[PDB]
Design a protein around this ligand. Structure first.
Ligand code: HEM
Ligand code: HEM
Lengths: 362, 363
C-alpha cells in the first residue's frame, strides 16, 4: 500500500516495479504563452508530490471556504498511495511551441508507417503525456482527473487509456503477468536492479547529443487491438507456435522452466520471441511496460480488447523502430492490429522539492 | 476473504460484500432452440463453479490435445478467486423466446421514460446479463470473456461495462467508498447482515405472483454520466447542498458523524438524500450495488466518467421506479445524465452441484 519516491535522477514509473493499474492521458496544449506553460508544469509538479504521497492537492478536498470549489476533487480520500507514480513526457508536436524547435531530441524520432497499421488519429499523438500507474485504479484516475482540472484553460485531454491489468515486468523475482491472449508477458525485459542494462538501453546520456534529456528516456505507446474471436479458435499448438513459448509455464519451446534462456533456432522462423529477441535485432533491447485494456464491444456482438503497449528506450531509432520492423513477418500479426500510436521524450527526474517537471528543457 | 461460495438459496453477488471491481455484460440470444439454450445455461453454471473457485473452465487452459483450442483462455492462470461472484439475470426480451412469453414476471416492469433520460439504445437492454464482481479486474474480465466464448453461437455480447472502483456498500462495518464526485456513497443502504430487511425489500417471495422467481431479485442498471468539469467548478457548499451531507465526513446536515441518521427538514428541498430517502418514498428502499467508470474522453477534451448504478429490489415497481421518479427535481440532475438502462429478473440461487442457472424457469 506504500509509496514510491517521487524525486530522483530519473522519473519514477519506468524502472520502478510495474504496478497493477494504468491511467494514461495524452494532452494537447492550448496556450501559446511559455510562461503560463512553465507555471503549469510547476503547479503539476507540486500536485504530483502530494498525490504520490497519498495527500490531497492544494489546500485539500474539504474544509476550505464554503464558497470556493475544493482544490482536490476528493475521490482518493481514504485510499493509500498505492505505489502511485506520475511520469510526464513531451511529444514531438510540443516542440513547435514556445520557441522549442531546436531542442526537439533527434532520438525522439517519428515512427514510420508499419504494415498493417490502422491508426485512429484522434487516439494517437499528443503534445504531452502523463502516465499514472498505481495498484488502485481509483488512485490513478484521481491523479489524472486532478491534473487535467489544474490544467483547465492551458491543456486539454486529447485521448486517454485505462489499463485494467499489467502485461509487463521490471521484477523477474516476482510472478510474470498474463496478457489477454493468456500468455505471460514480461519474462525477458529489463529489471529495475539491472543498472548497467538500464544505462545501456533505457536512459539517455549527455553524449547522445541532447543534454537536457540526460537521465530521461523515450517512450513509444501503441494501442494494439487483439482479434480475440480469431485467437480463441486457434489450437493450443498454433498459439504456442505464434510465440515460441508454451502457454502454461511460458518456457521457451523445448524447455521446462519460464526463465530458461531461449534457443531461438528451435522456434518457428516467424515466432514473436524469435523476431523480437535482442539477438535478432543487433542487440536492440526494450523496457516494455504495457497493460491490458477492454473498451466495450465492437457494436457487433463481441468484446473489444487489446494491449496498450508501452516501451521505454534510450533512442527510438535503436529500440522500438528496428524491433517493430523485424515484426513485419510475425505470426502474431494474424491476431493483432495497431490502432493508436504516440511517441514522447520523458525528461530526467525531479531532483528535489525545488525542482519541476521539464526544468532541464525550459 | 479469498472466495465467496457460489451455491446458495440466493445467487451470490447481491447481499454478499461488495467487491472492488466489476465487469458487467448484457447478452442477446441468437439461438431459437430452447434445448440449446438450456444446454448453455448448464455449461455456464459448470464454468461459473470453476471460475468462482479460481479454477480454469473445462479441462483447463493448457495440457490438452495440441490440435484443440484450450477450454479456458488462460488469462486468470496464477491469479486468485478474488471473491469473484457471477450473477445472472434475464431481461424482458428473453421471454419472447422459447415459448416463455407468459412467464415474464409482473415485477419485472419496464421502466417509464424519466425526465432528462438520454438513453443510448445500443448500451441499454439485453436478453440476459452476467454481473462479474471481484477484487482483481482481470479475474472479472476473464470470467466474462470465457462466458462469452462458451456462449458464442447461442448468445452475443450486446454491451459491456467495466467498473474500476465500487460506489456501494453491503458492509457498514467497513469504510464507505467514494464516487467520482468525491462523496461517500453507500452509507444508508441495505447490508448483507440485515436478513429481514433483505426478505422485505430485496428477495422475491412465492406469493408475490411469480413462483419461479422465489429467492431471486430484480435488477435495475443505469449508466449515469457525470458532468465532472461542471461539478468541479461548483463550490464546496454547492456540492454539499446537492446531497444533504458534508463532503469530508459525509454526515447529514447538522450532524457530526457519517452514520448519524439524517434530519431531512434541514436539507434543501431538492437535496438528493432528502428525495431518495425511504421516508420520502412511501418506505421504498433499495440495495444499491454500483461502481464508478471511465471510458475514454468525451468528444471534446474532457475525461468521460460516471457511475454504473445497480439496484436490487423485490419489485421494480415498488423499488427503483418510485425513488427515481422522486428524483425528477433533484439538485444532482444538473451534474448527471442517465445514458444507458436495463432491467433483469435475477433468478434464485444454484442450490447444489447438480443445479443450474435458470432451472426454476425452464424446469
Ligand atoms: C498485443 C501485442 C503483443 C503481445 C500479445 C506480445 C506478447 C509477448 C509474449 C507472450 C512474449 C514472451 C514473454 C516475454 O515477455 O519475454 C513477448 C516477448 C517480447 N515482446 Fe511482445 N507482444 C506484443 C507486442 C510487442 C511489440 C509491439 C513489441 C516490440 C515492438 C514486442 C517486443 C517483445 C520483446 C522485445 C520481447 C522479448 C523477447 C526476448 O528478448 O526474449 N512485443 N511478447
Ligand atoms: C451518479 C448518480 C448518483 C450519485 C452520485 C449518488 C450519490 C449518493 C450519495 C453521495 C448518497 C449519500 C450516501 C448514502 O447514503 O449512500 C446517496 C444516497 C442515496 N442514493 Fe444516490 N446517487 C446517485 C444516483 C442515485 C439513483 C439513480 C438512485 C435511485 C433511483 C439513488 C438512490 C439513493 C438512495 C436510496 C440513497 C440513500 C438515501 C437515504 O436513505 O438516506 N441514487 N447517493
Amino acid at each position: 500500500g506504500s509509496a514510491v519516491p517521487f524525486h530522483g535522477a530519473h522519473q519514477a514509473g519506468i524502472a520502478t516495479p510495474v504496478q497493477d493499474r494504468l491511467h494514461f492521458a495524452a494532452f494537447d496544449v492550448t496556450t501559446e504563452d511559455r510562461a503560463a506553460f512553465v507555471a503549469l508544469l510547476k503547479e503539476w509538479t507540486a500536485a504530483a508530490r502530494r498525490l504520490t504521497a497519498g495527500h490531497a492537492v492544494g489546500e485539500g478536498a474539504y474544509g476550505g471556504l464554503p464558497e470556493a470549489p475544493p482544490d482536490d476533487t476528493g475521490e482518493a480520500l481514504g485510499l493509500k498511495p498505492s505505489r502511485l507514480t506520475l511520469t510526464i513526457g513531451f511529444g514531438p508536436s510540443l516542440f513547435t511551441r514556445f520557441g522549442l524547435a531546436d531542442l526537439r531530441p533527434e532520438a525522439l524520432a517519428d515512427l514510420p508507417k508499419f504494415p498493417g497499421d490502422n491508426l485512429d488519429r484522434a487516439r494517437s499523438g499528443g503534445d504531452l503525456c502523463v502516465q499514472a500507474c498505481a495498484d488502485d485504479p481509483q488512485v490513478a484516475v484521481h491523479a489524472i482527473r486532478n491534473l487535467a482540472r489544474i490544467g483547465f484553460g492551458k491543456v486539454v485531454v486529447r485521448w486517454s487509456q485505462l489499463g485494467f491489468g499489467k502485461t509487463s515486468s521490471t521484477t523477474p523475482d516476482k510472478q510474470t503477468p498474463r496478457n489477454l491472449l493468456g500468455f505471460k508477458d514480461g519474462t525477458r525485459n529489463i529489471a529495475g536492479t539491472e543498472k548497467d542494462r538500464l544505462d545501456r538501453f533505457v536512459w539517455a546520456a549527455e553524449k547522445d547529443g541532447t543534454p537536457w534529456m540526460t537521465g530521461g528516456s523515450y517512450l513509444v505507446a501503441r494501442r494494439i487491438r487483439m482479434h480475440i474471436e480469431t485467437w480463441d479458435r486457434a489450437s493450443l499448438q498454433e498459439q504456442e507456435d505464434v510465440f515460441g513459448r508454451d502457454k502454461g509455464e511460458g518456457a521457451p519451446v523445448g524447455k521446462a522452466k519460464e526463465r530458461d534462456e531461449p534457443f531461438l533456432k528451435a522456434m518457428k522462423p516467424d515466432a514473436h520471441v524469435r523476431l523480437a529477441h535482442p539477438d535478432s535485432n543487433g542487440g536492440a533491447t526494450l523496457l516494455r511496460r504495457g497493460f491490458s485494456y477492454t473498451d466495450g464491444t465492437d457494436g457487433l456482438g463481441r468484446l473489444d480488447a487489446g494491449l496498450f503497449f508501452l516501451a521505454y528506450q534510450r533512442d527510438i531509432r535503436t529500440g522500438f523502430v528496428p524491433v517493430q520492423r523485424n515484426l513485419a513477418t510475425d505470426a502474431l500479426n494474424e491476431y493483432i492490429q495497431h490502432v493508436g500510436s504516440a511517441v514522447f521524450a520523458v525528461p530526467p527526474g525531479v531532483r528535489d522539492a525545488d525542482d519541476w517537471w521539464g526544468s532541464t528543457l525550459f
